[PDB]
Amino acid sequence: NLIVPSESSDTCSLIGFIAAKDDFSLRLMRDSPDIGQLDHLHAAEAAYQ
Amino acid sequence: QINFYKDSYAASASKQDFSQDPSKFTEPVV
Amino acid sequence: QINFYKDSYAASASKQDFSQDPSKFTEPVV
Amino acid sequence: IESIIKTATDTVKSEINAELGVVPSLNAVETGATSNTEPEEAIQTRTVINQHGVSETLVENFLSRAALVSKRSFEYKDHTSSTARADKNFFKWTINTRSFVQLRRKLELFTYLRFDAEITILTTVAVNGSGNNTYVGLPDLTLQAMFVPTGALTPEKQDSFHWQSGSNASVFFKISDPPARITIPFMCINSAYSVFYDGFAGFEKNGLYGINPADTIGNLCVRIVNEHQPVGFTVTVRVYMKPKHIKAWAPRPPRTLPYMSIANANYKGKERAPNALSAIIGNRDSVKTMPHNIVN
Amino acid sequence: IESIIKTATDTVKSEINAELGVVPSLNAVETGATSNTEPEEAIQTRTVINQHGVSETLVENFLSRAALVSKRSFEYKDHTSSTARADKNFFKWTINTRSFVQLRRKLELFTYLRFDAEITILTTVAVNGSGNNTYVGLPDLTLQAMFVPTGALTPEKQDSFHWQSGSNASVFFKISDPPARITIPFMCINSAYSVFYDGFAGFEKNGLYGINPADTIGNLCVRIVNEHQPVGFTVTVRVYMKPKHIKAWAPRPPRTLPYMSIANANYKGKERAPNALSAIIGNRDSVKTMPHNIVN
Amino acid sequence: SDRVLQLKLGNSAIVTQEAANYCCAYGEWPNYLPDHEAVAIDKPTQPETATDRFYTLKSVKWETGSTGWWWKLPDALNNIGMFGQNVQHHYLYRSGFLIHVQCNATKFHQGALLVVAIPEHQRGAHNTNTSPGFDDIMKGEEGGTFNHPYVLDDGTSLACATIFPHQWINLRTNNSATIVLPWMNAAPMDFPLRHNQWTLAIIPVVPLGTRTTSSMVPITVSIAPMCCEFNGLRHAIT
Amino acid sequence: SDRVLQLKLGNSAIVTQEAANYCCAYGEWPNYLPDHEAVAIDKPTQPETATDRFYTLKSVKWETGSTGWWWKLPDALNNIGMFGQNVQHHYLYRSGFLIHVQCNATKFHQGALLVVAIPEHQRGAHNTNTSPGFDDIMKGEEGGTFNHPYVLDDGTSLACATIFPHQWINLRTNNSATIVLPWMNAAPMDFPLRHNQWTLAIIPVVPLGTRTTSSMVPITVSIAPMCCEFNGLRHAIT
Amino acid sequence: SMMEINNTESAVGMERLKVDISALTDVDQLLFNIPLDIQLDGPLRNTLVGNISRYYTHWSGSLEMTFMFCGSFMAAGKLILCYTPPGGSCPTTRETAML
Ligand SMILES: Cc1cc(CCCOc2c(C)cc(-c3noc(C(F)(F)F)n3)cc2C)on1
């Protein structure tokens, strides 16, 4: 169990991190699905004015 | 490859740099 | 033939493999 | 015996044989071995110096031949009033090698294959005749073919942002140009492709059977870069694939019955022979009849 | 340890470990160092000779890919009665790399970049359908692309004297030709480009924030050399840029929220997750729930 | 007799007095995965005698209208002994197989069996566009029968099935067949519950016949896993 | 802290930051059975990483009226994982054990645990001539509690139990105990289902006490079989 | 880089970057689980490894998952972190997870 005294907060926190080792390898580069575009960005057309 | 151009920056991509130092981001301590 | 490409898989067909072992299908017994 | 074979083997002269305890013509099919009887042992032969090459039957030569793998026609026009079922100036194809019978049957002669693909794209255009349209002439258009690997988003419109292709491999080519040509490497996550897969794709029981997840390729999205014009056209794109640097393992019996689907090896056969379910080879009157008998 | 890495590291076999004073699995995140625990130290492993190459993740390969940086459509026609807002048979573009999200996000993974640019220009033409115009056909036009560095005057008309280009670099290309291609060197007045600039451009307080003056490029002016014709057309010019000979410094966190403008890094996020301001990753029921649980 | 052979494989053993030979698929023997072909970095478990042993399956009756039987591996051996326990508790396996098919009759009996090990015998359905389902493929220790042995149940031909590692049981000649199959796969290891590397098919090309008193003529199948390895230990999943 | 220690034992691992040392019973380490001490001529199975790994048992609450807990080996590990499968499918086994007992509290908590591995802890009953029954002895993974920890439940004394391989968990000092037990038996191997070589007992000699906010204080036990061997393979018997 | 394990509603901003653990009155209790699907939206998606890997299609190699306890100096506990190779359902009990 998580045992704390009366003067300590009874709820504690964990932080999780993840990383790759030297074994790691990637291949078959593609377009990342994390960025998109539905229209022109602001000021983008002003570059033609 | 061929690069019959007089300027060296006109050459193709140089994909032969296999040296790396990950410890400058993973163990940047003393 | 020519293959001025940087990747080896871009080359042409390699039609020069004349080794064969038919006995692995015709006499697969001991 | 593994050796280098460049020509067919030569024949050696033989004499009369009558020796007890030696029966070269007698074999045992039950062992699973093919008969080792030689022509020199069955008949009296002469010496023949054979000079026939065997380079045409090499698996590389046998399989290194461009074959149609994809063929798609779509209308290049104004698609404002078209339904959400037609190809609106573009299309996407889930790459596969089971849609056209010739290449499929040639590939399915082996259990495992490892090769690089050579992709050639050939585009033709025709002037639409629907309504009262005239010939007009054939425009010289630019097409973009983008390869979207598994997990990547595919375009939904002819002008969607996906076509900017920051990392996806695209090729831009004109119709007046020679057919476009690129090379794809051996993309399998395994050491070879699985022509046949006796398994299921997922970890649950509702997955697909016979399709190996390791052999997944992706999508080929082809669009016309040009914007539509006052008249409609029909654009047909044909994709041919040529294996090269081939390695083959575990040859298989050829398929006799016609293919039914690209997803499975289902079979029903022809109504009558040949290639029927109950009779692969056409019938003759009896086992004592030859159809093409020379009669003089 | 700086060394040459061509493949992923191999694994070594390990045995049972029970030794006092050694705790490889225990780390100290507060030091700012990543855990140095090895798989050989956390579990009992076997010897694996790893043959995976690492050439695809090289920064050169990662970034050396042509991406759309500019796309402009304008009417090629008689512009006598057109307003002073449309592109009258030509246009100018202030070169930047922040207009299209894919290349912008790939480039913004580093603080400093040094590379030569490979510029490819692809032009398409369509017949105007406004009014009662017909297809007619697609003319083979000549386009001129002129690079005007900072401080140089830019053309104001399609036939202004600026187009004579005594010293400015121009390229003349036909639509029927392959896409035009040139190379621009590393033009920065510094040793590297500043992908991000925590400063102001001028010596006063009204300057632009986040744009480095040292990284200014200039203008790309594209005109149709042909004079207008009895019918109007729409010409679309696309400019793709490919970095090469790349050097990268200080990798940065990737952008999660959608881009709002090309001038700044302003953010508002999506209305709901994923990629919302208050929730980048989509929600699940609880920390004890997995959505894609294998159930059999 | 025609040939004698003994197969030990652990705490089990088989003796045959009327055999032809035994077949080594493609002239190769089972072996453990080398370090230069390994993928999973976890240390494998090699039970050996516990798993590398003959398991005998239920016998099938050799009748006149018999179309043939098939057993898929390792599916048939899953849920059988320590091999089954290791399969259930592990995520990856790797193994060859020594297969012994037994069938005897009298000298007044005639009949020919083709015993063939098909690699990746992906099956098809008949007269339908739907693919075979999970229950059509996964039959366990009982195996299945051939719907259309003429086409091998996949639209190919039975006549060309001799391209695969095979033997014959000709009642006039021998009463047993033996095939040694190495590890056949495009991957060094595999998940045992969703993919079958081998399918053992026994097909009655020549039907059983006699004019003496009729007796039940069964066919028995014994499979010995060889050089078994297992990676990815966790709870049992069956 | 007072000492740190890491215990890998397969695909598992334990880290302790507040330990005293670890105990090797009688100063010996587990080992496989040599040829000059073997009895059974059958080739043994040595699963290794599949069986030589930490198994964690259910936790027990550390209360004020607690008399102590005991777990008998291999009885407690029988029916747990590949070790349990190997025990069920085999007639003889042989193994050492690495035992790790975990218990932590705050710095305002006091209490002392004696963690002792009794060899051949044959139990007795209280106030009766009848011997303990099967259900009194075989408790499985759950174990049992001490009726009279004063006499060790056998008419001896708890005060002299330190003659056995033991450690202490003094909340003021450490929060874990580790004992390495070799194979202890008069025979080279034994039937796992009818005899227990070791009994791990955790006894509250000094009761738990504090004046701060009360919390549940559990005690966890992890046992890693070591150098496991199995002989006499047959069907599972459980 | 930090995992967004607390990707649940009622967690806003930085609250999604930490997992809260309290004192329980039952033994062997499950605290949380992490979906290991980088290729799909989950705790691993917005990580350096995840972000850079989502630019590629095929991956291989080993991962390390580090956990930092951020309680007070004199709060104590023992946890068990378990990785289960694929094939079955996610373990819900410690007895199944320890395997
Ligand atoms: C068996 C077997 C054989 C294969 C290989 C088929 C390769 O499929 C393609 C095709 C047909 C076209 C492209 C392609 N078309 O265009 C482009 C580019 F222009 F974007 F580069 N790539 C890419 C692949 C992988 O996969 N499994």
Ligand SMILES: Cc1cc(CCCOc2c(C)cc(-c3noc(C(F)(F)F)n3)cc2C)on1
């Ligand atoms: C970061 C970062 C990256 C860069 C480089 C962008 C290069 O921009 C261009 C483009 C897009 C086109 C031309 C160009 N187009 O046409 C001609 C020519 F034909 F006149 F030669 N040059 C020149 C430059 C510098 O600058 N900052």
